[PDB]
Design an enzyme around this catalytic site. Structure first.
Site, mmCIF file in Angstrom:
data_model
loop_
_atom_site.group_PDB
_atom_site.id
_atom_site.type_symbol
_atom_site.label_atom_id
_atom_site.label_comp_id
_atom_site.label_asym_id
_atom_site.label_seq_id
_atom_site.Cartn_x
_atom_site.Cartn_y
_atom_site.Cartn_z
ATOM 1 N N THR A 1 -17.742 88.781 72.506
ATOM 2 C CA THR A 1 -18.876 88.513 71.604
ATOM 3 C C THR A 1 -19.101 89.926 71.259
ATOM 4 O O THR A 1 -19.058 90.425 70.326
ATOM 5 C CB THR A 1 -20.116 87.478 72.999
ATOM 6 O OG1 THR A 1 -19.563 87.665 73.670
ATOM 7 C CG2 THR A 1 -19.446 86.331 71.911
ATOM 8 N N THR A 2 -19.443 90.577 71.931
ATOM 9 C CA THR A 2 -20.179 91.895 71.816
ATOM 10 C C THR A 2 -19.617 93.113 72.527
ATOM 11 O O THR A 2 -20.160 92.212 73.608
ATOM 12 C CB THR A 2 -22.110 92.239 71.513
ATOM 13 O OG1 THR A 2 -21.994 91.329 70.611
ATOM 14 C CG2 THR A 2 -21.749 93.417 70.897
#
Ligand SMILES: CC(C)C[C@@H](C=O)NC(=O)[C@H](CC(C)C)NC(=O)[C@H](CC(C)C)NC(=O)OCc1ccccc1
EC number: 3.4.25.1
Lengths: 230, 195, 69, 239, 240, 92, 49, 48
Positions: free
Chosen positions: B1-2
């Protein structure tokens, strides 16, 4: 030229290499199996060559399924290979038919595995003899699978060194209406006849297959039966 | 995701969020994206949970055999190359983007970015995942050469925090790891760095 | 009866112990036990001398390769 | 008997395997001996390292090999054969982490190594491998564990074990020492192992000759002892 | 002995004769000497010219396994060229998968495994050639290893393979290899080969000299012509 | 070395006479160096023997100047310990 | 030791009752103890063999 | 033992054992078999 190959017939009788494999089975630690009215009791002489060898490591009486157990007389490395294959065939039966393998069928399937090695080629036959036990169908079952691949059922039997002395002892003392505990005493006694030394809880490994499953007796339990006679 | 990695002189600071999402449902609100490939090499994984978990486990097995076989600590460049070879070979099959950042005695703290194609580039700072697009400016704005580990740890926590707020996919907790000659120190920030 | 003997040794204890001891093996235990006493310069054979020879005589497998059980 | 299965891995009258029995002899052909001693909380491997020529690196010639971080082995036998077994043991240990999610128990590495050896005996077209492997590791709920495998495929757990030319005498010294009731600490186990080689060979070897590898409950990693550490134990046992 | 015929069959005492017979062919081969100087490893081979019709550089016994790694072979050359290809492949795969130039210790272990495999199977004879591998890296420094026909590999500060291995090793021990500069070491290698040449028995011979080191920037290049010519002059003067 | 061993004996004989007991302990590392030295394995052994001979004089001191028969036993085990580090196959 | 005790005193062996050991086997490497030391034993017992 | 010639020496060794004890033992003379030359050593001979 004969007696050097299992792919050729004897010029009269039978292939000698399978018979030589039987000779290796004969040169094995004594194994006694006593079928009894309520269970089958199996036993072997486990004597370490030196005090250093740990008696809690490799085990001669090894469970194959919850209700099925195996004991061996013959070359020890070969036994582990068939102990694994027998256990696997029991699992394949459970996946296919969702029922624990019947003892009679397991012996037939194990025997087929042993026969494959006896087949023509570089492969040499297993040097082990086995004493499958079971409580399937509410009836105690004791069977023997030989290196050749033949399978037979024995009320009581012995294999390895002094098989003849053990079998004659069994002929004299084995009845038929005996509980497993009485059968445990007789099994320990037959090993004692061929035991070159004083039996101790570590020296003898005993496994029972009552109507509950195949459970190797704890070292403490073996000692109690070895004590108080037997 | 990040996922983000910054290389200080003596090591690398790696950080990521904690969200695994199926559609708009969060399967795990507390996911460890960062995984230890080796004692001093870590990989932060983005993309498909199953594909990333499999390639990471496969590399961990291959690197472990290589290190025992050669009796030496593994270089980060080889660890990145093992991930790159699998990603390029199974490009169509796998959907994973990985940041391989680790400390190696021979070349020091290093950060390698393998995009989903299996390309490999060594980058001073690499950001990856859905949230990466949102923080590209902050990353190329607040990055200064020679940042300390404490400054890099602050930079990662801030950059990941800014992306997590913008990206629905990224959210939850920020997991931070600093890898150095001493070893790896792992801290979980409970959504700190609020701006 | 031929050898002097400890006169305190219990020969029965060795007999009660099992093992496949042939007549030749029994001769070896007795002869070696006397020999061990001669090596230690004891005119009378001793109970300890018998046990060491008994163990030596019951070499049993002695070598063997462990596999073949 | 002889002149029967001498040339092939086939059964002989009296069921004796000549080619596999000859393999145990090849381990002795190495000319080196190894001793391994279990302890209350420690497992110690000791071997004699002979540097044939000064123009040879002492570091390169090592018969003590780590298989996994927590597992190390001493190889006695032909050098090429010993190294091949080491790769297989490392691969199997690695697969166990790869397919079962946990580190191989020392008992399990032996069964796998022994099973590979047994197949070589049953099926032809393979030489049995002239090497013997002793494996030391700490197992939770089992304590420090010392295990040994044979070319035939026999595997067993030993409180103390030896291999090579002096195995029979070495076990005999160990048997007297093991018979003593006292348990052995790290110092005692290093001492018993070094003394066992010392009594059997009579070399009174300098620190360079003995190679000692030790795994402990406190430090589970297999550690190859440095020459300085080896000397410190060697001087202390002499007193 | 009867049992000597098959590599798969152990002798009753416990040794394989087929592996031993391979080594004796290595012993029959012309000597190759390699010395590990602090700045890299220098290799020299006593290549023997035969017929004189063969052009110079024919039947070279020095090969490049990888740009950094280099190999000297003593025995049947055909077996060596096969081993060189196996090593070139292993180095190729290592850079190919691991991404970095092969560590000499790993390449030596892998080529040794290929030699070891030949010993265990009846269909294939054990390899009849013995080779040594030398390379220079900043990370590992100079490294030298020798692999015998039985696939046994161990590190050597100096080693010789061939008829004069023992005679050459005695001369090699005298050299201060640990601190000697490689340019000086090349001259010593020429002399050691000239001492063990036994030229009257071997007739003509051509010296092949190979260099890997800091001077070579980690490339196993053949010593440049003229540097060898000086070494040949130094050896010839020392001989007389 | 033989010259060094003669120097060691001459240097500590005066010191041993002056000192109650510590000087023998002071010369013990010199004994260790000679036990370690195998360059001759004969003259070095005689230098060790000279150190042992000074130890015998120290035992005469142990019976007389120090409490009678108190440190001689400790020295006797210690001389055996000095031999223990380098038995050399019970030779030299 | 084995040869001397019967040679000095067969009667002491007779008191024990053990037959004096007739012989011992010097198994050894060839030449080192076979070519030489074969007749050295004769000097040890001080008689021709 | 062989078709052309059998183990006559092995028979002589068994005969030697009979000569050594009983029929020919006097003067405390030791018939030591101090030889590494024989390829095979009789196990019965090894007996004390
Ligand atoms: C490596 C992960 C930690 C990153 C994680 C981020 O949330 N990625 C994901 O979770 C991806 C979404 C991604 C395609 C945007 N989704 C998933 O992995 C989920 C499984 C959930 C139980 C977690 N869905 C899934 O794997 O099945 C469909 C699929 C199959 C292959 C690739 C992509 C999607």
């Amino acid at each position: 030229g004969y007696s050097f190959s299992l792919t050729t017939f004897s010029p009269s009788g039978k292939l000698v290499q399978i018979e030589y494999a039987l000779a290796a089975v004969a040169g094995g630690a004594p194994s006694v199996g006593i079928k009894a009215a309520n269970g089958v009791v199996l036993a072997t002489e486990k004597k370490q060559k030196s005090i250093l060898y740990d008696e809690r490591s490799v085990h001669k009486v090894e469970p194959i399924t919850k209700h099925i157990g195996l004991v061996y007389s013959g070359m020890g490395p070969d036994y582990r290979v068939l102990v694994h294959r027998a256990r696997k065939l029991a699992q394949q039966y459970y996946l296919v038919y969702q029922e624990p393998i019947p003892t009679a069928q397991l012996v037939q399937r194990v025997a087929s595995v042993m026969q494959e090695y006896t087949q023509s080629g570089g492969v040499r036959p297993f040097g082990v003899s086995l004493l499958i036990c079971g409580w399937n169908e509410g009836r105690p079952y004791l069977f023997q699978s030989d290196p050749s691949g033949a399978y037979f059922a024995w009320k009581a039997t012995a294999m390895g060194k002094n098989y003849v002395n053990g079998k004659t002892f069994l002929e004299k003392r084995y009845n038929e209406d005996l509980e497993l505990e009485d059968a445990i005493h007789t099994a320990i006694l037959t090993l004692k006849e061929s035991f070159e030394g004083q039996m101790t809880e570590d020296n003898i490994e005993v496994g029972i297959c009552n109507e509950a499953g195949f459970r190797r007796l704890t070292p403490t339990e073996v000692k109690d039966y070895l004590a108080a006679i037997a | 995701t990040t996922i983000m990695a910054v290389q200080f002189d003596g090591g690398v600071v790696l950080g990521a969020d904690s969200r695994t999402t199926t559609g708009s449902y969060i399967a795990n609100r507390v996911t460890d994206k960062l995984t230890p490939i080796h004692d001093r090499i870590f990989c932060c994984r983005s993309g498909s949970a199953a594909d990333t978990q499999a390639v990471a486990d496969a590399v961990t097995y291959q690197l472990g055999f290589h290190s025992i076989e050669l009796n030496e600590p593994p270089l980060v460049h080889t660890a990145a190359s093992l991930f790159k070879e699998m990603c390029y070979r199974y490009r169509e099959d796998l959907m994973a983007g990985i940041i391989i950042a680790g400390w190696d005695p021979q070349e020091g703290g290093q950060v390698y970015s393998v995009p989903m194609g299996g390309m490999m580039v060594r980058q001073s700072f690499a950001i990856g995942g859905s949230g990466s697009s949102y923080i590209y400016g902050y990353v190329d704005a607040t990055y200064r050469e020679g940042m300390t580990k404490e400054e890099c740890l602050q930079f990662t926590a801030n950059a990941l925090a800014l992306a997590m707020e913008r990206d629905g996919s990224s959210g939850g907790v920020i997991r931070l790891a600093a890898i150095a000659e001493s070893g790896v120190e792992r801290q979980v920030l409970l959504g700190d760095q609020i701006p | 009866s031929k050898m002097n003997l400890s006169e305190e040794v219990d020969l029965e204890d060795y007999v009660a112990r099992p093992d496949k001891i042939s007549g030749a093996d029994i001769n070896s235990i007795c002869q070696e036990s006397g020999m061990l006493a001669v090596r230690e310069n004891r005119y009378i054979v001793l109970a300890k001398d018998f046990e060491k020879a008994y163990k030596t005589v019951i070499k049993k497998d002695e070598q063997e390769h462990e596999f073949y059980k | 008997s002889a002149g029967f299965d001498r040339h092939i891995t086939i059964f002989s009258p009296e069921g004796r395997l000549y080619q596999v029995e000859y393999a145990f002899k090849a381990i002795n052909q190495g000319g080196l001996t190894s001793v391994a001693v279990r302890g209350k909380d420690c497992a110690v491997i000791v071997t004699q390292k002979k540097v044939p020529d000064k123009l040879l690196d002492s570091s390169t010639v090592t018969h003590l090999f780590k298989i996994t971080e927590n597992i190390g082995c001493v190889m006695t036998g032909m050098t090429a054969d010993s190294r091949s077994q080491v790769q297989r043991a490392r691969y199997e240990a690695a697969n166990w982490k790869y397919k079962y999610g946990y580190e191989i128990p020392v008992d399990m590495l032996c069964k796998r190594i022994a099973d590979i050896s047994q197949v070589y005996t049953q099926n032809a077209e393979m030489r049995p491998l002239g090497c013997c492997m002793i494996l030391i590791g700490i197992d939770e709920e089992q304590g420090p564990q010392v295990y040994k495998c044979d070319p035939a495929g026999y595997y067993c757990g030993f409180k103390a074990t030896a291999a090579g030319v002096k195995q029979t005498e070495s076990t005999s010294f160990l048997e007297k020492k093991v018979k003593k009731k006292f348990d052995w600490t790290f110092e005692q186990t290093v001492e018993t192992a070094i003394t066992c080689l010392s009594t059997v060979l009579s070399i009174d070897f300098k620190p360079s000759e003995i190679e000692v590898g030790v795994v402990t409950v406190e430090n589970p990693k297999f550690r190859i002892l440095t020459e300085a550490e080896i000397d410190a134990h060697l001087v202390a046992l002499a007193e | 002995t009867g049992y000597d015929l098959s590599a798969s069959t152990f002798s009753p005492d416990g040794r394989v004769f087929q592996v031993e017979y391979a080594m004796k062919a290595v012993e029959n081969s012309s000597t190759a000497i390699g010395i590990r100087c602090k700045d890299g490893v220098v290799f020299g081979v006593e290549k023997l010219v035969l017929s004189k019709l063969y052009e110079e550089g024919s039947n070279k016994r020095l090969f490049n396994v990888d740009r950094h790694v280099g190999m000297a072979v003593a025995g049947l050359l055909a077996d060596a060229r096969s081993l060189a290809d196996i090593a070139r492949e292993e180095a190729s795969n290592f850079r190919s998968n691991f991404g970095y130039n092969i560590p000499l210790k790993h390449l030596a272990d892998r080529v040794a495994m290929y030699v070891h495999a030949y010993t265990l199977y009846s269909a294939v004879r054990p390899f009849g050639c013995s080779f040594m591998l030398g390379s220079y890296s900043v990370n590992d420094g100079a490294q030298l290893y020798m692999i015998d026909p039985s696939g046994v590999s161990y590190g050597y500060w100096g080693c010789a393979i061939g008829k004069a291995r023992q005679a050459a090793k005695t001369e090699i021990e005298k050299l201060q290899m640990k601190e000697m500069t490689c340019r000086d070491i090349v001259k010593e290698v020429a002399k050691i080969i000239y001492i063990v040449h036994d030229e009257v028995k071997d007739k003509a011979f051509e010296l092949e000299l190979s260099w890997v080191g800091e001077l070579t920037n980690g490339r196993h290049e053949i010593v440049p012509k003229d540097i060898r010519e000086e070494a040949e002059k130094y050896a010839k003067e020392s001989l007389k | 070395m033989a010259d060094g061993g003669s120097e060691r004996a001459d240097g500590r004989i005066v010191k041993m006479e002056v000192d109650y007991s510590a000087t023998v302990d002071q010369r013990l590392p010199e004994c260790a160096k000679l036990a370690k030295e195998g360059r001759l394995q004969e003259v070095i052994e005689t230098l060790l023997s000279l150190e042992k001979q000074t130890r015998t004089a120290s035992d005469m001191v142990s019976t007389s100047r120090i409490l009678v028969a108190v440190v001689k036993m400790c020295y006797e085990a210690k001389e055996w310990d000095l031999l223990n580090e380098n038995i050399m196959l019970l030779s030299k | 030791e084995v040869i001397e005790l019967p040679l000095t005193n067969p009667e002491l062996f007779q008191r024990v009752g053990i037959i004096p050991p007739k012989g011992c086997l010097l198994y050894g490497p060839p030449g080192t103890g076979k070519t030489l030391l074969a007749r050295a034993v004769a000097s040890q017992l001080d008689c021709n063999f | 033992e062989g078709t052309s010639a059998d183990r006559e020496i092995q028979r002589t060794l068994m005969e030697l054992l009979n000569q050594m004890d009983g029929f020919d033992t006097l003067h405390r003379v030791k018939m030591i078999m101090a030889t590494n030359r024989p390829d095979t050593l009789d196990p019965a001979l090894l007996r004390p």
